Write a protein that binds this ligand. Structure first.
Ligand SMILES: Nc1ncnc2c1ncn2[C@@H]1O[C@H](COP(=O)(O)OP(=O)(O)O)[C@@H](O)[C@H]1O
Ligand SMILES: Nc1ncnc2c1ncn2[C@@H]1O[C@H](COP(=O)(O)OP(=O)(O)O)[C@@H](O)[C@H]1O
Ligand SMILES: [Mg+2]
Ligand SMILES: [Mg+2]
Lengths: 528, 528, 88
C-alpha cells in the first residue's frame, strides 16, 4: 500500500487536540451577539464572509495529518448538527472541543476510556431527558417571531418577515429564500396554483397591458400527451365557442397544427383561448395535472389506464376556473370550482404519501403539491447591495427559518446557554456504576457550562463569573449579552429550539467521547 | 481538501487593510481634474492607459492571500458601482477604503462590530435621504451639456457632442459610441428605418453613383419565409408593373429562381425592383418585419396564423414608402405611409413590453425598435490617432454618456464632494441607540469628507483646509480644482447625478462595514 | 524663502498631530486668530498663552531653527554621493 506513520499515546493526543483547538478557536468567535464574522477565501471569486459554524468548519483543512484528523472529527460534528437540525453548529463545535479537551486529561495508565465514554453517554441521555422536561411548546405567533429574531443574529426585520410568512402560509407551509435584487427584504406569497410556464404563441395576449392573457370564468382542458392534429382539438373549442367562454389548454405540448388552428381562430373571429405546457419533467407532471384537474374539476385526457380521449369531450368534462393569468414565463389559476370535498381527499392522500416515504426530493415536490393546493407558498427575497452581503444575510435567514421550523414541532427552552446550565442538577443525582462512569459524568458536568461561558467571553466580560451568577439566580433569570445584564428570558424574549440544543449536545458528545478513546494514530506520510 | 491557513484578529486586519490601501492608492490618483492616468500592461498587445476606477481596480490582483482578499473586497465595491450607475467608481473605492480604515481602529475587545455596521447603515440611509432632499431635476439642455462636460474629464467637446445627440434623439434615445477612424469626433444620426443589410444581386443599381439603388414612392413586399419560386413572386411584380412604381422585396431570402426572374426583368425591360433579406437574425426578425410593415402599411407574408399567402396579394396589401436607399451593406426606408395612429399603438405595445421584463439583451433590441421606429439612433464615432488614445477617449465618452443618462432620470446635485459635505448636518441629528451605532455614525461622518479631500490633494493643495473652508462657506459655494478657487456651482457649472453619488456611497458603506466585522481569515496555502 | 515659509508651520502641525487632531486645520485657525491666542494641546483648545502659561526661550527656538536650516539647506545642494563599499 502506501507508506504510513504511527504515533502512540500522548503525542498523537496532543496533535489531535491542537487541531481541534485550532478549528474550534476559528469558529468559537462567531457565537452569540457580539460574535464576529470569518472571511473565507474563495478559490475563484470574491470571498465568503460567514458567521455559521460549518462554512468556517468545512473550510478549515490543516496541513499536518494529525491536526487534520482532529479537524475532520470536528467537521463531522458540525456537519451532523447542520444536517439534523439546521442550526446548532457553533455550540456543537464548542461542546465537542470541551469534551475532547476534558477527555485528553483523565487518560492515565489506569483509566478506561471506553467506560469514560459510557459514562459520558449516560450523562448525555440524562441531560437530554431533562431538556424535554423543562421544554414547552410554541403556541403564540409572537414566540415564532422571537425565535426568528434571535436566530437571525438579533435582526428583528428577519423575525417579523418570517412570522408574517408563517401566518399567511401555515406553520408547516413552504417558505423559501432567494437572492433578492432590491435593497430591502420582500415577502412574496404565491397564491393559488401557479407553475413556471407561460403561453406558447405570443398572439393570445388580450390585455393591452404587461404582456398577459387574462381570463375570467374559463374552461380548462388538461391533456397528458400532445395535442397534435386539428381533429382532437376541434371538439373542445366547439364546446367553448358554443358556451361562449374562454379556454385554457394545459397539455404536454400543442403541435404546430393545433397551434395554428388556435392562433388562427384567435386573430380572426376571436374564440378566447390560450395554451400552455406541463409543469414537470416526466412523472411529476403526471400527478400535477391530475391535481390541477381535481382542483378545477375535470379529467386529464390521455391517461395510461383510463381510456379518455380528446375526441369525446363534454362541458362537464372540462375544468372550471374563476380567474386565469398567463404571462410569458408563468401561468396562474386562482379559483377552481373543483368540489373541495374531493380535493380534501386528495390532500389526505398526499399527506399520507409524504408520511410513508422520504427521499429529500420526492418529499420536496410532495410538500410543493401540498402548499400549491392548500395555502400558497412564501418566498423571501433577501435585500442587499453586493453578492457577499446577500449571501451572508441569506445564510442568516435560512438559519432563522430552520430554527422557526424546528421550534414549532419540538418546543422551546431558555436561551443563552441557560437551557444546559439548568440541567446540572440532573447530573447531580446520577449514581455512576464505577469510577470511569463517574469521570464521564463529571466531564459532561463541566462541559455543560461552555456555551454561556463562550457567549460572555465574546461579549467582553468574564465568562465564568457570569455563569456562576446565573446558576445562583432563579430559574427564569439569565444573561442578555447585548443589553449586558440579567433579565427574565421569556419576558425579554430569548428562547431556542429544544431540538437544536439536544442535537448539538448529542452529536458533540458522541463524536468527542469516541475521539477521546484513541491510543494510536496512523497517518499517510506526505510524499509531496 | 486543500491545506489552509487561518489568521486571527489584528494580524489579519492589518494585512487586509494593507491590500485595501494598495488597491485604493492605485486608483485614488485618478480622481477629479489634475488626476492622472494609469498604464495597465496587457498580456498580448499595447497596454491600456486608463483613468477609470474599475480597470485600475479589476486589474490589480495581489500575490499575498490576505492583501488579495482586501483587493477583492474593494473590486466588488468598484464593480457594483459600475454596474449599478456606470460612474462613481473611484469615489466608491475611496469611500470604501475610508470606511475600512476607520473600521479597523474602533475594534477593541469590548466594541461590537455588528452594531457598528448597523450604525453605519443608519447613517448611510440618513445621508442618502438627504441627497434626495437637496437634489433637483435636470430640465434645461445646458445642464445636460454641463454634466457631460464634467464627467468627460472636463472635455467640453464631448459635452457639446452628447448634448446635441440628446437633443436630436431624445433624452431616452439610443446613443452608442464606436471606435472612429478620423481625427475628430462625429455625431451620426441614423434616421428613419435602417438595417445593416444590402441588396442581394448587384444588378439593381440604377444610380450611376456610389453603388446605390434609390427609389421614390416605392412599394414594399414583406415576406417572413423565403420567396423560392417564380409563382409566388410573379403577382407582386404584376401589381407593381401595372401601377408603374418601384418595388422593394424584404424577405428572409430570395431563392435563385425568383432572383433570376427579378434580375431578368431588371436588365431587359428595366423594371424598378430591389431585394433584401430580413434584418433580424432569429426570432427578432419576426417582430421587426411586422414593425416595418405597420410603419409602411401592409402585411408580412408567410405569418403562422395570419396566413396571407404571397399568391393572393393586392395593391392595398403592399407597403408604401416615400424614399428607399439600398447599398451593398445596409438598407434605409425613410417615409412610410403607415397610419401613424397604429404605429403609436405599436410604440405603446413595445414600451409596455420593456416595462414588463428585463434581460439586458431583450430590452436592448426592444429599445432599438423604439428608437428605429420613433426618432432614429445617434452614434458617436470617437476620433484619436492610435488605439490607446481611442480607447481612453471612448471610455471617457461612455462615462459621460452614462452620467448624462443617470442625471435625466434622477436629478442633479452639487459637485466636487460638496454633495456629501452638505449632508453632515443630517448626521448631526441622529440619536444612536447605543455606543456602537454612535461609533458607526461617527465613522460615516468622518468618511463624508474623503472625496473633497482627495480632490484637493490631487490638485496639489491642502485637502483638509479646503474642506474646512468649504464647510464654513454658504450652501452653493465650493471648490473648483481646475481654476483652483471658490465659486458658485450651478452658476459655474459643476453638478453630478444624485444616482451616482448615492450608489457609490451605499455600495462602499455596505461592503466596507461588512469587511470591518471580521475576526478570522482563512486562506489556501500558496503552494506553487 | 518659500521653503522657509512652508517649514515654519511644521512644529505646531506636529504637535497637533501627536495630540490626535488635524494639524493643518489647527495651524490655520491659529494664524487666523489674534497675536496672543494659540493652541493648548493638553486641554485641547484655544487660549491666551502668557495668561495660561505657555512660553519658551527665544534662544532655544532661534538655535533650533538656525541649526536645522543651516544643515538642511546644505544637504539639499548635493548632486553626487560617495559611499564606501559594504564589503563584510
Ligand atoms: N441576546 C442574547 N442573549 C443571550 N444569548 C443569546 C442572545 N442572542 C442569541 N443568544 C444565544 O446564541 C446562540 C445563537 O447564536 P449562535 O451563537 O450563532 O449559535 P448557533 O451557531 O447554533 O447558530 C444561542 O445560544 C442563543 O440562545
Ligand atoms: N472642476 C471640478 N472641480 C471640482 N470637482 C470636480 C471638478 N470636475 C469634476 N469634479 C468631481 O470629480 C468627480 C468626477 O470625476 P472623478 O474624480 O473621476 O469621479 P469618478 O471616478 O466617479 O468618475 C466628481 O466628484 C466631480 O464632482
Ligand atoms: Mg443559530
Ligand atoms: Mg465620472
Amino acid at each position: 500500500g502506501s507508506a504510513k506513520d504511527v504515533k502512540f499515546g500522548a503525542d498523537a493526543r496532543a496533535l489531535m487536540l491542537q487541531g481541534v483547538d485550532l478549528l474550534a478557536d476559528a469558529v468559537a468567535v462567531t457565537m452569540g451577539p457580539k460574535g464576529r464574522t470569518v472571511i473565507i477565501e474563495q478559490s475563484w471569486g470574491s470571498p465568503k464572509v460567514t458567521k455559521d459554524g460549518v462554512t468556517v468548519a468545512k473550510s478549515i483543512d490543516l496541513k499536518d495529518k494529525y491536526k487534520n484528523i482532529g479537524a475532520k472529527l470536528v467537521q463531522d460534528v458540525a456537519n451532523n448538527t447542520n444536517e439534523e437540525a439546521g442550526d446548532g453548529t457553533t455550540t456543537a463545535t464548542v461542546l465537542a472541543r470541551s469534551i475532547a479537551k476534558e477527555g485528553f486529561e483523565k487518560i492515565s495508565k489506569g483509566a478506561n476510556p471506553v467506560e469514560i465514554r459510557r459514562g459520558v453517554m449516560l450523562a448525555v441521555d440524562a441531560v437530554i431527558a431533562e431538556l424535554k422536561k423543562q421544554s414547552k411548546p410554541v403556541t403564540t405567533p409572537e414566540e415564532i417571531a422571537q425565535v426568528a429574531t434571535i436566530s437571525a443574529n438579533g435582526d428583528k426585520e428577519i423575525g417579523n418577515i418570517i412570522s408574517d410568512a408563517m401566518k399567511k402560509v401555515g406553520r408547516k407551509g413552504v417558505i423559501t429564500v432567494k437572492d433578492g435584487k432590491t435593497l430591502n427584504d420582500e415577502l412574496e406569497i404565491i397564491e393559488g396554483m401557479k407553475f413556471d410556464r407561460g403561453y406558447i404563441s405570443p398572439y393570445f395576449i388580450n390585455t393591452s397591458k404587461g404582456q398577459k392573457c387574462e381570463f375570467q370564468d374559463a374552461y380548462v382542458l388538461l391533456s397528458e400527451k400532445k395535442i397534435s392534429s386539428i381533429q382532437s382539438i376541434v371538439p373542445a373549442l366547439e364546446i367553448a365557442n358554443a358556451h361562449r367562454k374562454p379556454l385554457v389548454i394545459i397539455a404536454e405540448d400543442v403541435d404546430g397544427e393545433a397551434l395554428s388552428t388556435l392562433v388562427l381562430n384567435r386573430l380572426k373571429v376571436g374564440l378566447q383561448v390560450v395554451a400552455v405546457k406541463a409543469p414537470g419533467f416526466g412523472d411529476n407532471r403526471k400527478n400535477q395535472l391530475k391535481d390541477m384537474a381535481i382542483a378545477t374539476g375535470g379529467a386529464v385526457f390521455g391517461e395510461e389506464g383510463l381510456t379518455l380521449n380528446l375526441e369525446d369531450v363534454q362541458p362537464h368534462d372540462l375544468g372550471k376556473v374563476g380567474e386565469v393569468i398567463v404571462t410569458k414565463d408563468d401561468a396562474m389559476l386562482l379559483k377552481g370550482k373543483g368540489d373541495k370535498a374531493q380535493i380534501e381527499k386528495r390532500i389526505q392522500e398526499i399527506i399520507e404519501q409524504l408520511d410513508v416515504t422520504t427521499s429529500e426530493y420526492e418529499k420536496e415536490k410532495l410538500n410543493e403539491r401540498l402548499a400549491k393546493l392548500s395555502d400558497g407558498v412564501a418566498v423571501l427575497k433577501v435585500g442587499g447591495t453586493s453578492d457577499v452581503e446577500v449571501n451572508e444575510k441569506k445564510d442568516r435567514v435560512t438559519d432563522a427559518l430552520n430554527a422557526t421550523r424546528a421550534a414549532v414541532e419540538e418546543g422551546i427552552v431558555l436561551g443563552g446557554g441557560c437551557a444546559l446550565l439548568r440541567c446540572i442538577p440532573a447530573l447531580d443525582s446520577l449514581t455512576p456504576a464505577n469510577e470511569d462512569q463517574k469521570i464521564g459524568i463529571e466531564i459532561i458536568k463541566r462541559t455543560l457550562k461552555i456555551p454561556a461561558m463562550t457567549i460572555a467571553k465574546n461579549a467582553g466580560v468574564e465568562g465564568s463569573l457570569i455563569v456562576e451568577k446565573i446558576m445562583q439566580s432563579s430559574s427564569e433569570v439569565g444573561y442578555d449579552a447585548m443589553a449586558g445584564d440579567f433579565v427574565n428570558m421569556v419576558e425579554k424574549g430569548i428562547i431556542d429550539p429544544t431540538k437544536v440544543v439536544r442535537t448539538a449536545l448529542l452529536d458533540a458528545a458522541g463524536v468527542a467521547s469516541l475521539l477521546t478513546t484513541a491510543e494510536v494514530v496512523v497517518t499517510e506520510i506526505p510524499k509531496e
